[model samples]
Target chain A: DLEEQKKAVIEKLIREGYIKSKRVIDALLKVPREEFLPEHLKEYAYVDTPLEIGYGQTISAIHMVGMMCELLDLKPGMKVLEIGTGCGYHAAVTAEIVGEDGLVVSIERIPELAEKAERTLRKLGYDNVIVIVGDGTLGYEPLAPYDRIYTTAAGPKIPEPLIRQLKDGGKLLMPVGRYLQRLVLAEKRGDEIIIKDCGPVAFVPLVGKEGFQG
Target chain B: DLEEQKKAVIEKLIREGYIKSKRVIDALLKVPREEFLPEHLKEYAYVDTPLEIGYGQTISAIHMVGMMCELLDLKPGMKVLEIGTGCGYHAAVTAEIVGEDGLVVSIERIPELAEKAERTLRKLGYDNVIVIVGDGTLGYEPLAPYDRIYTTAAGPKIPEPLIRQLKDGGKLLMPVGRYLQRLVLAEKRGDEIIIKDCGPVAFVPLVGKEGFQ
Candidate 1:
């Protein structure tokens, strides 16, 4: 029944054009979203909406996750940096897309959430993702020059360090705004950065230096 | 602020790939969904989820509306048929998409709903949509040969008359199943009909001769 539900969800996404790429669709089919949700919220895993995962964080809606993946333009053996590793559901999806040859370095500001997400990802045997507990605004300096970067929370603007860390022709997507956020995609091109507005979205505030204060 | 909220809703739909076509996005922006909802539920006009509009019927979610519009592949001046004109919200969206050159013939099984939806559409000045009270499963015969057909209710299978009413190469979409339903898309291709599963959905039962008894 769960398999059927998963298939139904994938079919709905394809019908709606939410999952465009074959790679994204395959990744979604391989990774079970229910495993990333808490016990109480697992029943709603395929609802195509967000659910609370504790600590003022939420597992982003499935549609939003799919949209972000499409924006990433992922490929095998690529390295991606993800901010706000909330339960590691997104990381799992990214891992499935990038395959075993790729690497996903994710950062979370909350220690408990980071640990819980790491445990869940490990239990599910997602070895390609490495969870780190730190302020994501810094762009995980030791692993700079990422091919793609995605921030799961809403910040007022793109962080300077994130731009500095992206490899040339790389893409960085995030929700930018205070009360109301818009999903923005930025690309690094040699010495210049090109920005495009994807659309409106709602997310918890990204907190730390280069993000919201307090 | 309502306009801003509407813009935000459209933006979200576009971001999520629901509003892929420029025409669909423009239609969504022009139509005020709040005007079609009951007074108490107006505050949630821009929310993506569906809400009850009484009579065991509901205005579909915004994403579903966008999906249907995309599936129809509408063009200006094309004739379209709609079933289950609940609250006239979907008809309004379709009318906007089809523009003034096009026509939307909608059927409602309940007289009260049909009358209310007609009044609402008339008040909103949607002249392109015409609401009728009848069994939607029989298909609107007076305006046969529809370029597109959309059914908002779930039935055991797509009604035969709908397929017959569709023009050659026309697309017809509806929810098919009892209890558990899947979105089915049928294309009238000359002598043969090509059907594809569009995924799972939940909707009220379609009540009529060609629907679930």
Candidate 2:
């Protein structure tokens, strides 16, 4: 019964074209969304909306998590950097895609949100993900030259720190704006960075030293 | 699997003194707690805690609802007044106890809270209960002299309006105090209302003209 509910959600997304790649699809199937939700909204785990975690932040909706991973082109042993770790569900999905050797260093601005997300990630045995509580825009400097980097929130513009962190030819996606936003996809090609406007998207404001009011 | 989870919660309470009466037990059994929770917390339906409803209020814990209903001595055809309808789970239990003809008029201070509670109460087919959005201390005056009345919140003192609204020989239960409270049981006996201290209790404060700030 438990697996049935999860399967049903993934299958619907498959028909919608939002979930295209097999690797992302398989990863989505592996992670149980209900586990990340606060006890009350567990019944709504598959409803395709941002499930509230705590401290006014939410686990990004399953479709968005899948879509972002698909865009990032996650694979085995890629070494990814996630800018927001609201409950760590996004990173968990990415973790499953990247396989065992793949490492995910997820940054969350709020210390409490990161701990709770870290706890769930641990309970689910996602040892590949490293949770960090710090300013998301600064982009966890200790592990630079990451294969991929993306943010869960929207900023006025892309932070330069994030572009510098990406390995040459590595990809990055983040929603850029204040109220209205465009999902921006960037690639570090050669010595220059190439940016693309993926589509109009909406997300909570990314707060940090470089992004918005802390 | 869902039904099994709920049964486990009740059976455990049955062993505890909190659920001594059979009517209250059956009522608790009939009401599906998951229905009142904000979908995320539905899995915690059977957990013995005050599940948050909305607007910083919570559906009172299952044990407190059972214990209060047991104390009130509810029976069929009784007109009951509930002071806080935080999602209506408590009233649903009492409604089941009062049976087909029993009426439960539940009061909630926030307009939006009453709507959500009323919506769930209707969804569950508890036609006997009426939800009102008003000050908890007022005690729904138009239908005065209720057979039983209880508040989900602990107040600085029991509201006088609530005492006057109870029918003679009828009983009332309310938690009194701001920070620390004693569960108070009062009886409307003849010309005077008798009050007795039951035990220490904790609840969100009851807000209105007669209660605490």
Candidate 3:
């Protein structure tokens, strides 16, 4: 139970029902979370808690990563979009699920965070994930129609651009509300946008156009 | 805490004073003990207890692996000779420390055990470990003058063949006495073999010549 600490926490999360899906499990196993953290906090990579990365950003907890990926129901060879490239950990996990055949366009508002993520992701040979330094709320329009999208930040409301960027029958997972945020899942059914309050959760505010405007 | 179970156990060993050494730490991390185990017992790979690997043989506990490696003071490019290749776990751990330039001649008496160990080691890409089916008590002579030697099984006395195979200034770690065995460390110096009782321990009998017989 102590030797495979990464496996143990994944198993723990699996047992707790926070994790499900074979693809997500394989993704978790293949990616080493320790490599994404700063040298000082690398030792705590396996703990079931959030960790500070840099620039006042945090890589979501292990359970949250698993929960988000599992909820997204990620599939192979599918195009995905991710908001918040903290250490590029979550995006790496997604990239693994989609494999080299697929693509992941990850957005980071902070240039420093994006640069750090780009280096780490390249070092890990995650060639399929492209980290873009821009506003996440606006979403990337050049690569519109993503099969699945997820954000690590909470917003006052779902960005219209994100809804417009999502492909038909695609799912977008994010946290809505500033102080008391609720996890929301938006599904695109042709021209209609169906929303569901998944559950209550906590996250940093999604800043810039269509988010927590400065 | 939960993600790195292997690391947690290694860290636990470090905190408990059972392990101390950078080379051994890297070895423990590089070679996974889970692959050496039977599919059924693989899940309990990290548990700090011995496990049966079929054929009436058992793989030693994780702490024991760390303690043994740390005590050996293993280094890169050092030839290592290991006795009792139970699932080839300990040998693989030793091979990792020795690196590609180094070699590991592992002796396992049982043919079936040796076959399984060979396949497992080969599959895990541990080309450095060579599993030979023969009496561990006799030691392997083709590749004599080993820098380090170790036994996973207990014996009534230290095997003379093993002492002969060890190079001068080399250390040999093994268990002595059948029922109540004590961990013994023997350092070969010229014609003299200085012996030290390391501590109390448990292990299977070192079968065949110069051992229980």
Candidate 4:
């Protein structure tokens, strides 16, 4: 019955054209949303709307998750850097798309969320994703030169370090703006950075160096 | 700037995980939603939300459009039956996904809406979609055994004709319920029909035989 529910959700997305790639659809189908949600909220896991995941952060709506992955243009063996690892649901979806050869390095500002996401990913057998607890705006230096970089939280502007860490021709996507955010995609084109405005979006603030002040 | 706006909307959807497939993304990108909307609402065309398209019926949200296309598993050369043409935006999106070789036959209950939608689709160069003025509950029998069927209006139950018109193993998706609706998907599995409940949704009512009075 749960599987049917998942199928129904996926079908709705597909019907609405929210999902296109077989790979993306397959990945979403494989990674159950319930696995990443708390026990009490599991019933609403498959719903397209966002749900609170503690620490004032919410696991983005399913549509947003699909949108983020599509913007990343994920592929096998490519390395992706995610700024938020809320509950590991997003990371798991990315892992499924990237496959075993690829790697997903996700950073969460909250220690408890980071730990919980790590544990969930591990339990779900998504060994490809590695969760880190720290200031996400700084970008993870250890795994610099990521092919793709995505920030789940909203910030006032694109962080400089994220741009610096991206490989040549690499893409970095984030929600930029203080109160009302706009999803932006920045690409490193050799020495120049090209920015593309995605659309209006709302997300939790990215708090850290190069982010909002405490 | 309009192109930038379209790109922004598509990217936001991509970032939100709403627009996943390249094909669907390309279709959304290629077909400017503003074209199907009224002149005053053009500014909000790419906002990922729905807007009024006259006739007391609103165009489905961009995310809903995306979901419907993905649910149909659309491919080039496939035939689709749409229950409500509205402003022809949904059918246009479906046509883009199905491509030139594919066909989309949409039925609209309102004569003015049907005529307007047909004109809009044609003006936008979507030759693959045909708008018909009739009762969608009866379905378009001339094009039987459709690969996919999508109804924009919510009904109490899946129209029997829609299921009959679906090719064996074809899928029919609709919002079913009286007040609060649930997106329902029914698949014709040989002799049996399998139904799945797809969470909550809201839509205008489908009125006619096989639908709510």
Candidate 5:
């Protein structure tokens, strides 16, 4: 109902170049960020910072969430895969863009985070996003083809399996590098993958079968 | 005649990790270092430091030359390609390892350096190494399918053509990155290339197509 109010702010940020894609900005406005924050922190829902959600994890900052969405070039009715489901904030934002016809399959390495996100999203009326507990590094391969892939944690290099699963014209947004993480946008075009680095960022380590072991 | 003398100096350098390749040290010792040096600095020929050889370029220090030789994995009867023939010292060292049956195709972008290397190698009776004055970025395609390729210049990114020319299971030794050059050892593993960094270094900028403009 407050779509117009949210849309205006997102549009302003985009016009100022803080956000790059219209699709991402639209999604951010459509998804109520308040639903993703803790009960006590609801007043600060729109601010940009990864809020601690306990278990030594965090809900990614709104700016990072917006950037990842922009890099993925999310479109309405696009199937998307999210590696981390922390607080279900990102999944909710993604679900808003993918629309009713599209779907978002998210996986969390920790079972507790998955359960928490599942409950929070269900209560928030986000039925289009599916939350699962598994190693995000290997990815949710059963879904097979995803139009866009987004990872919330940083990894050494993009895994071959994740690259293999992306639909040919798809894009994968990941934080790559060890000592210093750079938000990388990898666009797969036929046999080659071109990587364009956005800006530097910091995130918790992505742990799974194919990602960093620790 | 000076092969034995070259062997002693190379052995000393290799034992100290100044040179990494057993094959290159063996080859350098088997050949003659004095044969490649300028007549004036022939006495300091075996010492580990870049020595001036007329042009702005200098023969790279023996330690770095040895390190590059080892990183290239020069072996008996292997065809090797050298992109910078500065002073021909590195060329002589390469020639020694590749031997008679082995071939060394050295290319220098500077015509004067190429001519000087040719004369120097000829004086040392290194008939196995060929000197060419041309763009090293395109690589010497005529000698396609080389087992090893080495570049003495720093480049922003590795050239795709050179990577194409290297035989599968071969190794390439070059310094990459400007201001922060790193000695990179890229080994061809089927279709994919695995890169291993051997720490940081500083070298003259390699100027040409796909290199420093």
Candidate 6:
């Protein structure tokens, strides 16, 4: 019965295009989301909706994460940049897809949050990910030339700097807009960037200089 | 005409209890929001609704800034912490109030944004405020024990670390909740924390560990 439920959830994600990589699915089977979730929310680990972590942030809903991954077109050697390192669950999924050859840099603006994500990733043995405690709007430069960038939070428009740092042909998936945000996918084309409106979605504000004012 | 409009906006903020310090009002009068606004939306700079900045963020209405200032009871020489440093406009306003004696620590999660705010503040000549490219949820430990802390983004719950970082008898103002959000004021009373619900409000989701999943 337990296996059936997990499979059902995984199947639903596949159908919705949330869990794209077979490797990610395999990793999901091996790595329990329950281990990363709070004890109270462990029961809903496999459910589709986003769950609360602590500090008012959330793990992106499976559907959203799936869409992001699909838009990203992640591969074995792709290096990924994650703007919101909420709970580090998303980082775990990305890490699994990227494998050992790939590198993942996840940034969180809140110190407590960065520490929590670092601990969660460590507990889950996601050693491949580099969790940094800093501003997300400003893309991490040391890990410059990212193959893909994923931002968990939503904002009105995409930041230009994030576009500049992406490697050519690289893809970035983020939610852009105020009340009605559209999931956008941008591809780096030489010096220019092209953006495609994927669909509508809601998320926390990526508060920063290019983001919202506090 | 621009100066007059700015004065009107700041006056309204004061009348409605948004801008508390006279010095802040004066600064608001001097700095033209029109200068900060994109050409397309320059007309609505004084309007109440939050205007969309390119990155799905907004420059909150002047009135809202004034209201937050009122709630903060901001004064000169008081250290303040701003949770979301979107655009750095609010930090500039706080800088006006705090003046040289006071300090404002603005935290941004995005590197692009942190740099923008840094440049904007420098251009505005508000060097006293420090912009940190770090997580807001953790509360900046280097500048621990703030007198006032404010958050622009809405979160599922009040961050415990932020509460712990507030000075005894200090105040933290933020909007807290999931689907239904409420503006809450938390007062740190030694080990015991008291939370008071102010009213209903809405904001963008806050993304980080311990934030809503």
Q: Comparing to the true complex, what docking class would candidate 5 get? A: incorrect
The TM-scores, chain A only, for the candidates as listed are 0.97, 0.96, 0.96, 0.97, 0.89, 0.93
Q: Single out the weakest 10-residue window by summed lDDT for candidate 6 chain A.
A: A44-53
Per-residue C-alpha lDDT of model 4 across residues A104-183, encoded as one tens digit per residue: 99999889889999998898899989899999899999986899999888888999989988999899999997544679
Badly placed stretches (over 4 Å) of model 5 are A1-12, B1-213
Local error of candidate 5 at B31, Å? 58
Q: What fraction of correct interface contacts does each candidate retain?
A: 0.00, 0.00, 0.00, 0.00, 0.00, 0.00
Q: Against the true structure, candidate 2 has what lDDT? A: 0.82
Model 1 per-residue lDDT tens digits across residues A28-138: 888878887778667656665444456766556576799899987899888999999998999999999889999999999999989988999999899889999999998
Model 6: per-residue Cα lDDT over B120-143, one tens digit each: 666677756766554677766545
| Per-residue lDDT value at A135 in model 5 | 85
Residues B41-144, model 1: lDDT tens digits:
99899888889998888899999999989987899888889998989988988988878777888888765576567667867888677666567898876456
Q: lDDT of each prediction vs. the true structure?
A: 0.85, 0.82, 0.83, 0.82, 0.76, 0.75
Best by lDDT: 1
Query: What is the overall TM-score of model 5 with all chains considered together?
Result: 0.48
Candidate 1 CA-lDDT value: 0.85
lDDT of 1 at B70: 92
lDDT, candidate 2, A1-214, per-residue tens: 6578679768967876679899999999988877877785676666654333446564555667877888887779998998889877888898999998999999998888889889999998999899998998989889868999999988878898988888999999999975446788999988898888876555667888879875
Docking quality class, candidate 6: incorrect
Tens digits of per-residue lDDT for model 4, B141-162: 6446799999999999888999
On lDDT, the stronger of 1 and 3 is 1
Instruction: Give the fraction of native contacts in model 1.
Output: 0.00
lDDT tens digits by residue: candidate 5, B84-149: 788787888787887767778776766556655765675668767766655677676645677898
* Chain B TM, per prediction: 0.97, 0.96, 0.96, 0.96, 0.89, 0.89
lDDT of 5 by residue, A34-95 (tens): 77666755655654444445565645556567767766788888889898888888898888
In model 6, state the lDDT of residue B90: 82
Per-candidate DockQ values are 0.02, 0.02, 0.01, 0.02, 0.01, 0.02
